[PDB]
Design a protein around this ligand. Structure first.
Ligand SMILES: *Cc1cc2c(cc1C)nc1c(=O)[nH]c(=O)nc-1n2C[C@H](O)[C@H](O)[C@H](O)COP(=O)(O)OP(=O)(O)OC[C@H]1O[C@@H](n2cnc3c(N)ncnc32)[C@H](O)[C@@H]1O
Ligand SMILES: *Cc1cc2c(cc1C)nc1c(=O)[nH]c(=O)nc-1n2C[C@H](O)[C@H](O)[C@H](O)COP(=O)(O)OP(=O)(O)OC[C@H]1O[C@@H](n2cnc3c(N)ncnc32)[C@H](O)[C@@H]1O
Ligand SMILES: COc1cc(C=O)ccc1O
Ligand SMILES: COc1cc(C=O)ccc1O
Lengths: 525, 525
């Protein structure tokens, strides 16, 4: 059947599309089941179909975003903005609420507006991918580097707006975000920070402006459609050196993290954002599962040994990168070797030393950590046929007991539901994003529902232990937000109150982060 | 003439007062003419009496704060929260709306809830001063250091919630803020970040939590009353060295800023937040105006030169600090010598190299830049009888040309109105806070009036030229917010719609940052 928006008839919906076409042109509104199949979640979760868009609209400018919002308010059409819509692992381009219209801001609004070499910033529209920006910086002989995620096909803006992470010293994307322009839910356009001051050259220079600081309210949020965003760019250092440390035992995690913290807290000698990847995660980047095991259920421990042997890796695999003058790189590599040396069976490789099949990730990290975007990590999805992943992304203290507790908790449930648990601890100064990627066969209905059931259990099992997620899939947003329920759900009530006063007709991305407008609360979609 | 909240009678006010005492006890409700004397703006601005409190309420817990708020909603009585109320230069403790009740949270809410050595953070009630925290740290033989402003009598929370700044690498106080508890305008209580998840250890570990990140909206804000705040604390480095560079000419400014930027933008070799102070700023810290020129008018150049000659200082004076093992310090001081030694007349000193009187400022910077709080900059108020200051604090791009244009513009008005211009450029990564202190006799009502009218001119002339203020005085709050009027005042309409959703009855510090709730809009207050 035709996907229509909640409470909107065929007749009123065809009026609504015609008006979108008036604004953007007829080629830039997509409305047929065929055309829309490309905007389904590529990695669907649950057996029952969900998150189905009713149309895709691609505006060329801010002026058109506004007119689209107005139309959507007049007609009661929920809108779900994206940049490039590559939020794979969290829903793709697919909207939380079935029947929403996707506003793909990145199709046509993809200009790099300014890259200022002197102040080390860039002003970007939301269609600028990491590749685009990288390509610009190469062409103009730039002395700046971008900070990217594992996959560079996503948007600098879109990724920042979901508080994604990268791996250079500028890994925390939202921290370095500086000013933004946004269309609010009734059509008004606003600029934050020093951009509210007309004629200011400080919009990308000073983030805060004057009065309350609102920029975070437009992250993981449905409070507006962002049309421009600035971001600081780090200077390319004179030299770098990436390294791998392999650790043999699963139980080495505790000690790894406890040794790490005093070296990370000060941003030296661990200058970048280290990553501790388990063997399923590294194996999956270079090989298929049927190369190690072709039986049923959890990979047995002898098969885990073959992966570690052939590829010459540990169960745990620490990847890091150092930057600066060559005498500094060596001092710091020296300190790191001394500390992690304690762990029996720890082995060290720099990016110069290792160039085999197992080294393919080290070589990939050394690109990423030097702000060169890659698609090498797409190979992960060939672990099994019709491969897809979901992100279960709890936050952990930089404490080996907490991490070992989370690891065992997750593994206990991943084996119970027959899913392989690829693990990647991404390590900040004071906390760790514990990304648990469960890779699975998207074709099979039972694999998908087991993924959904399994992750619903872990959200609740994690919350009961005091752990929360930093980011989650469409299908888990209500469940995740339901865990942030201190003071009788105070945080949610606050968010719903702001939502209702900026978005009286409940128009922008309803359900995002479990925040629904008055008119959807209680309906269970 | 007895001060009362707008449209509240003597008896309705009496009953409210009585209810406040029920909540907090008798001792902690001040309401008599000269009890409240101490809560007037200590550096009054304008000849007319503005900014008059009707009462002061000192609660001891979050619960009393919630109740006080509920009672204020019942009566329509404005509340003006402070921490320690030492916001001098901007209004001190005094409220923006005359008739509001001060809620001095810090008087009894002054516990250091936790200092964690492992993860390098603190959890604090509003009453912890920088002296108190430093005393905790000395007692416990801590590895951590704080980041303090010029005057350490203020609160860690108060300063942070006004987006204040200190001078260690952790200088940007708001960015090292992590997690807070807040009472919202109708008495609901809410924890931000991971604090919203019952039993999390991660409140002071991961700031963002999940979904929209609101912490920024409680800074320069009137959206709640803050009861707890977390802040990250830097590790104390093994050694340190501070340095003064003097630049003899007034014109060297342009060249000093242009050389500074590449040495600062990557936090190395300028690691700390450098300051560029003029001779006026530094003289007043060590001497009275009458030592150099007894006279009604602006200070002649021959008096400027004697100041420089006796104190052995330049017109522009550059104060920085280096941290790390002694080899790294020698390296980085090396590079700083060679870069700023391009400027003619420029002379260098370290903290070991000066015991004279002009050097007392360097010794005060060497404490502050190492997180040793101080009150030496109080001597600044001696400069003239009954000294007070006000802060006009424009943001500048870290560009020499833009820093001379702001300097001359400000100097011209300083001379026209007969006020001395003390200047300190506080230098971030990509921006500068250009802080202009104008010192004056607060007893003379013409001088108070010259100040208000002068800064009113300055705010308007600075915005015409493309510059906004980071922070401002009660006096200037409406005028500063009118300058950020991009999009037909798009920013202010936004802040008001949010204010009016969370505070239907217009209770919390109305007028703060030029943001007035519905019941006060379009009025002369
Ligand atoms: C499968 C996978 C995913 C992945 C990864 C590795 C693998 C194998 N590694 C990642 C990493 O290192 N870091 C990271 O942050 N994410 C990683 N992912 C997940 C994901 O693919 C990436 O984050 C990707 O960059 C996100 O997609 P994109 O960049 O295209 O973002 P989007 O889909 O357009 O938007 C994301 C959400 O933000 C809100 N949004 C976006 N644009 C707007 C505008 N203009 N206005 C308002 N809100 C906006 C929407 O909620 C949108 O869904
Ligand atoms: C005269 C002067 C001032 C000064 C300075 C040097 C001199 C000679 N140097 C400064 C510096 O180096 N850095 C800096 O940030 N400020 C400097 N100043 C200005 C001032 O002295 C300090 O900022 C001072 O520490 C601030 O005072 P305090 O810490 O006591 O904060 P407060 O007066 O209580 O309140 C500040 C404002 O924040 C909001 N606020 C405060 N508490 C709350 C709660 N609990 N809830 C909600 N909002 C709150 C209020 O708006 C309040 O006015
Ligand atoms: C599934 O989403 C994520 C994936 C990764 C790396 O593979 C890092 C952070 C994420 O949020
Ligand atoms: C009164 O305002 C300020 C004063 C100072 C003095 O060093 C620094 C920052 C400020 O905002």
């Amino acid at each position: 059947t035709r996907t229509l928006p909640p409470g909107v008839s065929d007749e009123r919906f065809d009026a609504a599309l015609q008006r979108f076409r008036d604004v953007v042109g007829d080629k830039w509104v997509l409305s047929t089941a065929d055309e829309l199949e490309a905007f389904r979640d590529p990695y669907p979760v649950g057996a029952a179909e969900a998150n189905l868009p009713s149309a895709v609209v691609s505006p060329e400018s801010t002026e058109q975003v506004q007119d689209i919002v107005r139309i959507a308010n007049e007609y009661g059409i929920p809108l779900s903005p994206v940049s490039t819509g590559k939020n794979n692992g969290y829903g793709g381009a697919a909207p939380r609420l079935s029947g929403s219209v996707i506003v793909k801001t990145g199709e046509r609004m993809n200009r790099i507006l300014e890259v200022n070499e002197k102040y080390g910033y860039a002003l970007l529209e939301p269609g600028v991918t990491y590749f685009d920006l990288y390509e610009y910086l190469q062409s103009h002989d730039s002395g700046l580097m971008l900070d990217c995620p594992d996959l560079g096909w996503g948007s600098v803006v879109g990724n920042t707006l979901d508080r994604g992470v990268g791996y250079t010293p500028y890994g925390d994307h939202f921290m370095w975000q500086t000013g933004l322009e946004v269309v609010l839910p009734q059509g008004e356009v606003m600029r934050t920070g020093m951009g509210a001051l007309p004629g200011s050259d400080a919009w990308q220079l000073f983030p805060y402006g004057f009065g309350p600081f609102p920029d975070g309210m437009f992250t993981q949020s449905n409070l507006g459609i962002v049309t421009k965003m600035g971001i600081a760019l780090m200077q390319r250092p004179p030299a770098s050196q990436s390294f791998l440390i392999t650790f043999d035992k699963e139980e080495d995690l505790e000690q790894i993290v406890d040794i790490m913290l005093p070296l990370r807290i000060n941003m030296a000698p661990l200058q970048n954002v280290p990553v501790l990847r388990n063997i399923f995660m590294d194996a999956a980047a270079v090989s298929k599962r049927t190369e190690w095991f072709d039986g049923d259920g959890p990979m047995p421990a002898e098969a885990i040994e073959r992966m570690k042997k052939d590829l010459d890796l540990g169960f745990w695999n620490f990847y890091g990168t150092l930057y600066g003058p060559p005498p500094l790189i060596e001092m710091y590599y020296g300190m790191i070797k001394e500390a992690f040396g304690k762990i029996p069976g720890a082995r060290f490789f720099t990016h110069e030393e290792r160039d085999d099949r197992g080294g393919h990730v080290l070589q990939d990290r050394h690109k990423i950590n030097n702000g060169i975007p890659s698609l090498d990590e797409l190979q992960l999805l060939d672990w099994v046929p019709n491969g897809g992943h979901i992100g279960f992304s709890p936050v952990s203290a930089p404490d080996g007991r907490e991490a070992m507790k989370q690891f065992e908790m997750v593994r206990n449930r991943a084996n119970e539901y027959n899913k392989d648990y690829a693990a990647q601890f991404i390590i900040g100064l004071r906390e760790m994003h514990h990304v648990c990627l469960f890779i699975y066969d998207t074709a099979i209905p039972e694999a998908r529902e087991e993924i959904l059931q399994m992750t619903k259990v872990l959200v609740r099992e994690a919350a009961e232990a005091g752990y929360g997620e930093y980011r989650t899939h469409n299908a888990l947003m209500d469940d995740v937000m339901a865990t942030f329920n201190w003071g009788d759900g105070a945080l949610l009530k606050f968010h719903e109150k702001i939502k209702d006063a900026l978005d009286p007709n409940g128009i922008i991305a309803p359900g995002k982060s479990g925040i629904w407008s008055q008119r959807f609360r209680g309906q269970n979609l």
